[PDB]
Amino acid sequence: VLDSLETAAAEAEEADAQSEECTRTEIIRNESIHPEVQIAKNDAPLQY
């Protein structure tokens, strides 16, 4: 049980660190760059 709790805590902290670094990278970027693809004139491309 202690080992399972330790692994759960480790994965939770890893996920929290990943979310924190993703948000930090988003803050550094001027705008939220997201993938786009659309074949038309200057319309709004769809969001993935």
| C-beta separation of 48 from 32 below 8 A | no
Single residue of 11, 14, 18, 20 touching a second copy by CB under 8 A: 20
Q: Rule CB under 8 A: say whether 21 interacts with a second copy.
A: no
Nearer to another protein, 14 or 36 (CB): 14
| C-beta separation of 38 from 45 below 8 A | yes
What does the block give as tokens for 9?
């805590």
Nearer to a second copy, 22 or 38 (CB): 22
Q: Rule CB under 8 A: say whether 27 interacts with a second copy.
A: yes
Q: Which single residue is written with the structure tokens 């930090």?
A: 24
